[PDB]
Amino acid sequence: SGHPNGSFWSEGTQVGLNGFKYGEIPLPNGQPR
Amino acid sequence: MFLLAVYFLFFSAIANGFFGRYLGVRGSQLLGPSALFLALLCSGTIFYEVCIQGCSTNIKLFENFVYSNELNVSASFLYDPLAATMTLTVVWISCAVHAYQNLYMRGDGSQTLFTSYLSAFTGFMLILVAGQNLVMLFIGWEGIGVCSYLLIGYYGSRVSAVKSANKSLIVNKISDGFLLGSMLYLWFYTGSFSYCSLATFQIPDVVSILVLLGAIGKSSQLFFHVWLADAMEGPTPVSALIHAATLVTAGIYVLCKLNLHSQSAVGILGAATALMGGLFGLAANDLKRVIAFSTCSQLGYMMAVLSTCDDGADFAMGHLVSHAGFKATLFLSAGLSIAKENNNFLNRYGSRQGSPTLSFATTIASLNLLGFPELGGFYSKESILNNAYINQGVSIILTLATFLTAFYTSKVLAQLYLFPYGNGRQQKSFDIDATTLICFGLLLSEMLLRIFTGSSLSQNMTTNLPAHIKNLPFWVALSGALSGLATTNLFSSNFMRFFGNRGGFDVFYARKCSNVFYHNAYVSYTLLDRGFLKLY
């Protein structure tokens, strides 16, 4: 438990999308929708 | 400067509830408490300017919020001595609860949304308190109602929690309907919604009854107290805020702001509520429910004191602001106890090694509840009891209520600390961080400052009473405490069962009122519009 690195001011452990906004899947190469 | 606190709270609400994806759980755990700390500085400045130095301010945000023919209302804030005191108390308690929720709600999915609800909840309380006209008060009143609806029913997968939220919503709806009626009466015959022109020396009884009926809703009095006990379904930080300052106190604040109440009704209702709340808290076996019934009893004291004397409004407000502190402490310590023991029932609590700060805070808050001499609660409660001697009927009931309060307070203390360990042999633990310690330090500082600064100007003013009359509340509290420590039986099993069912107010509603409601619905729909008036 505690904070991830033991420090409250450490970088977030979650990388990526928390969810899919409007249900849309991000394009692979970064192509705009 | 005066506007800043409401801005800080509503900014915390918007930031955590709409951009919490970017901020994160840690981001809430900073932006919430920091913003409420800044609001606490602003509220302290307001308290010094208005209360101590007697400088009321009016801020008109904009005019013609509703402008239809003669009906004209504006969004204005007037910080008068009552408003500054309630603002300071509310912001102090809310900053403490926001510090508390950082560790308590870490195991909850939506901590950001919880923080956002808490901050908008405080903001609507400050809108209610600081409004210069009746419409701003109604805005804050409905805002706290909806925020309570969204906070009690936070656990949506529990049928009990959502039904509790529905109960709160419906009861509060009836109460504000009565208030809206009284508001319309006062606008029609006084010419305005502002409290300054609101003053009437003689008011017809209908307006007084409507005001009282509206007030007894949020300040849960008898026949309107059903929602407070069920409000335990929500998370512990919600219970502390609703019982300490935001919801329960609002009716008392409205009754003190506009002195249209009648002495006969308020005293009887308050004394009855105090006695019934103490009797109900006697039977209860959840830690959290006993404290809610004690909140009911203290509300009964505050409502009763209005009938006694001209200073009754000041005494009620002083007990209000004193009560917020130790009651909030009692809920926060109870919530920590539940987390550490994974239990809600008083039987299985017991002596166990813990933090000295939490046990001391619980002890001092319970001592303030009991009436222990030379404490902030003691003065604010003796100011009520001693001044209620003139109303013989009220005084007797309040003294028995003091006995009952002492009994269940001492019983809870013995069961939590003095009693042997009652829970099972399993690994259970809740380690407390420095933030929770800062929370309890803030509550303890409020309690300590209350002694030095006082609650009312006439707190230590002499009530010309014989000594045996004046010191009687102490003896009744001591006898109640001694009987509570011995855990003696006070009532027969039939009356204990009656009190455990809280007087059967809800069972009457179930069996008669709800059944009649749905039979009216059956007649209206099935028999008539989908029956008689529907073609084959």
Partner: protein
């Protein structure tokens, strides 16, 4: 009532307004409550220790006024024949 006449009112209307004394507190004791009010709000947190002389004087005058009220009650009750 006539037997126990009202005392002289030391505090005047302009002084009571200047001290912002509510009408409920204007009860032949108003000058002493002006003293107590100014000293209490002068000392926000030490008034309990510092402001004890003014509170004592106010309580004393209030006690005298309360005795006058009880005397009036007894006189009226004996006039009606209840005692």
């Amino acid at each position: 009532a006539d037997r126990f006449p009202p005392p002289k009112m030391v505090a005047t209307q302009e002084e009571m307004d200047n001290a912002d004394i509510p009408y409920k507190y204007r009860d032949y004791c108003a000058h002493l409550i002006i003293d107590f009010k100014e000293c209490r709000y002068g000392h926000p947190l030490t008034w309990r220790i510092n402001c004890a002389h003014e509170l004592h004087h106010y309580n004393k005058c209030s006690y005298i006024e309360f005795k006058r009220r009880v005397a009036i009650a007894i006189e009226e009750k004996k006039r009606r024949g209840l005692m």
